[PDB]
Ligand binder design. Structure first.
Ligand SMILES: O=C(Nc1ccc(CN2C(=O)c3ccccc3C2=O)cc1)[C@H]1C[C@@H]1c1cccnc1
Ligand SMILES: O=C(Nc1ccc(CN2C(=O)c3ccccc3C2=O)cc1)[C@H]1C[C@@H]1c1cccnc1
Lengths: 467, 462
């Protein structure tokens, strides 16, 4: 990795495009206004540690970038002078300052999340150079926000159907690994799901948390053994009971997820699980239940189908709220077609049918880690303040064509008003400190991470509240 | 990176789930049929080299995995012995064979693209373990296909409005670096666009290509200097003419892109470009022209407004096909909201208002590299064949699917592509298998250069 080759190409030429005596370029990030009314600020620390901290510039990288740009542009348009200056004066450390709201904070749309500026007047071009790498925090932010929004649905419906929040943290399992664009995307997205939940299959998220954030607990995410069509079918139709028995006996002390639709769902439930192997299931611990995956079809219909047939063979009870509840050794997982919308439908549909949410857990692949863009929360990075010839300019973009909410102006700060509202103060109005302390803190300054947060602090900052 | 930590958690437990005496698990990858009739096969060589070749299993990697799984599953369900067996018997090299169609090959939907299987029967479980990393090839495949589909639209309109395809490889530029989820995605994504085009701002794609593919050319992709709002909005309302002037003069030997809707699209074009700096515009090389980025709003409407505005101030002259051409020192780039659908609208709209496509180039970000899923081309990975107790069984998941047995890929005399199921390929009626061993027991048996891939992925009309 070489930071000198980690930017949009056109930004390499920017050191030649500014008015002379430009000493300061100040830029900020927000999730612009105009269902996701608030965002979970997560992911910056990862970027800061992995790509920006310490000696990121060397003689080798300078010459490597010089050679690539020469061919790529078919012209000498690379700042060897400016980059050699960072190497000589700062030992390749970036003379930049990043200030940001604490990770895991829940912030309404249209508020500053983080700001960037150069610290040395000579490195005015550096602010826009690192824009590309920083804007990429749109992804862990979007992943964390959507994952938190799904947790709200689950919390509301588990409280409405049971009066408790039992296993809430395990009700949305991450299955996204194979559905994402890369190994790095997987790790980042999985770490972002884990901000709100404790169940993943994207092992990549565990090593990411341990390396860049840390938890007091031995792991940030958990999983259970599971049996798919590929393993069941290798046994053959006449050995489905033998398959089921082998799997459940191997995983006696922990929960086990087993597919029911390989041959015949009704027979797997009613006859195999409900008759032949019933002695092995009824014996199971509340901590180690058998989890059944439904047949393919409508996510609500298949869930409803499974619940009803299991209820014909196993003792179903009415909880404190009057909702149908399966025995503790038996649970259901819906891992087909789950996104923020279908989740709301399955849980509403279950309530209507007097079935508790205590019974069900969900799985999400592409709809949790891939079918997401910078467009969802309107993640924007704009320059708001420039110092040319000692003269400060409150820069912005207010186009008449797309009005939107438009770019903010000048130096920025985030505050929580006495009334508990988040406010972003423009044109340096925050320097008045009328609205309390600035919520943004210096996380990065001149090649050093100055402020860090453990994943536990993040989790705690991201907590659901009974307001 | 630790391959023992790069699978879906549930797959870790699979060695405890197959019937006794399971000797072979053979799986394949396909873009199942359902707009996108033909797919570009690209990206596996990268996965092979970065994650699968050489000593991938080590005693340290086994120990790290055992410790992570113990906590992750709250029990001991990790195959310590089975991984130790690969460490000792194979020097930590994976006993697997991947047979794939050549990179860059354009294959119709519903065909075998690549197959995976274990070479050692003790390692039957391995085919499932590596599914996760291998299916991730959906992404470079999808980017390369969607980018090539756009290349077909731009070829159709460049032909009808101009009679030739000069500059086709520069009509769709990559702006995707910001819009993607990670540095890794950016490089993979950008490298997949570079199969069909030569214009990129996602520098990470170049380095990937160099390391994993290679070119005869020094760089696989190219770009031009460009002026964003931030660099313009910094000079103040008063010196846009001095900003424009500073940029155009600094970048004289190369084309120059200027986003001209910072203050006024009409005035910057009519007064600034049109007259005040017209001497530094008409003087410019055809190989180094000025490129104007349209104003905000509807991408077609704004492209047309700019073209009409530039008309009433510059020499607009009809070409051989009778399409409105701009002078060769003046060009336009539409970089906002461009995707496969909007591109069609724009090029058709331009043809309708009698504007040649030589006038324009396009830039795509999120739409090119990020707004794409495994469902777009029904990218499917399935186990088709399993050998249990010496008995070869054909498996297909049929809920409320798959091809059967050992698969092969052939081109018929008529030129059709056919996937031969259940080992039928042995007979050799329809020629030779297009699937070549690209990986065996820890080594990349066959590699492709980027030049070859581009040759293979060429348009039929080129
Ligand atoms: O279904 C699977 N796993 C599974 C099932 C269910 C769960 C959710 N759960 C818990 O954690 C838990 C803890 C204690 C009691 C009850 C539960 C409870 O119900 C968590 C994980 C894997 C096959 C599917 C998969 C994975 C990746 C890609 N494709 C498909
Ligand atoms: O617009 C930009 N560059 C640019 C301009 C124009 C072009 C298109 N073209 C060429 O390359 C070229 C070569 C030789 C002759 C003629 C041309 C010719 O017409 C290609 C690229 C960047 C600002 C926008 C951007 C970049 C990254 C992320 N967001 C936005």
């Amino acid at each position: 990795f070489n930071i000198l080759l980690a930017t949009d190409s056109y930004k390499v030429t920017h050191y030649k495009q500014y008015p002379p005596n430009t000493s300061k370029v100040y830029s900020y990030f927000e999730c612009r206004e105009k269902k996701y009314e608030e965002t979970v600020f997560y992911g910056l620390q990862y970027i800061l540690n992995k790509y920006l901290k310490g000696k990121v510039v060397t003689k080798e990288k300078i010459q490597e970038a010089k050679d690539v740009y020469k061919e790529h542009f078919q012209d000498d348009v690379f700042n060897e002078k400016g980059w050699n200056y960072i190497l000589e004066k700062y030992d390749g450390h970036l003379p930049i300052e990043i200030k940001a709201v604490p990770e895991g904070f829940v912030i309404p749309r249209g508020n500053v999340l983080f700001t960037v500026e150069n610290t040395d007047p000579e490195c005015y071009w550096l602010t826009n150079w690192i824009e590309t790498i920083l804007v990429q925090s749109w992804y862990p932010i979007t992943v964390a926000t959507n994952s938190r929004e799904q947790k709200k649905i689950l919390a509301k419906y588990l409280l409405e159907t049971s009066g408790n929040l039992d296993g809430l943290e395990y009700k949305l399992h991450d299955f996204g690994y194979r559905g994402v664009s890369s190994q790095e995307t997987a790790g980042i997205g999985a770490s972002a799901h884990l901000v709100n939940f404790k169940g993943t299959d994207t092992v990549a998220g565990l090593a990411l948390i341990k390396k860049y954030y840390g938890t007091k607990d031995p792991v940030p995410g958990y999983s259970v053994p599971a049996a798919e069509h590929s393993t069941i079918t290798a046994w053959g139709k006449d050995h489905e009971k033998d398959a089921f028995e082998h799997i459940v006996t191997q995983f006696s002390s922990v929960p086990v997820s087993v597919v029911s639709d390989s041959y015949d769902i009704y027979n797997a439930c009613e006859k195999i699980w409900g008759e032949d192997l019933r002695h092995l299931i009824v014996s199971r611990s509340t901590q180690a239940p058998l989890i059944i995956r439904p047949d393919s079809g409508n996510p609500l219909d298949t869930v409803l189908k499974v619940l009803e047939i299991l209820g014909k063979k196993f003792p179903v009870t009415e909880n404190s709220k009057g909702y149908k509840l399966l025995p503790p050794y038996l649970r259901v997982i819906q891992g087909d077609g789950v996104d923020i919308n279908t989740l709301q439908e399955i849980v509403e549909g279950m309530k209507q049918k007097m079935w508790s949410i205590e019974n069900i857990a969900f799985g999400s692949g592409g709809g949790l880690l891939q079918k997401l863009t910078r467009d969802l929360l309107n993640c924007s990075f704009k320059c708001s303040y420039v110092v040319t010839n000692g003269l400060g300019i409150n820069v912005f973009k207010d186009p008449v064509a797309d009005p939107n909410k438009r770019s903010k102006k000048g130096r920025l700060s985030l505050h929580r008003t006495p009334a508990g509202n988040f406010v972003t103060l423009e044109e340096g109005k925050g320097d008045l400190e009328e609205y309390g302390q600035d919520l943004l803190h210096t996380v990065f300054k001149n090649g050093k991470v100055t402020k860090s947060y453990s994943f536990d602090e993040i989790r705690k900052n991201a907590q659901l509240n009974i307001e």
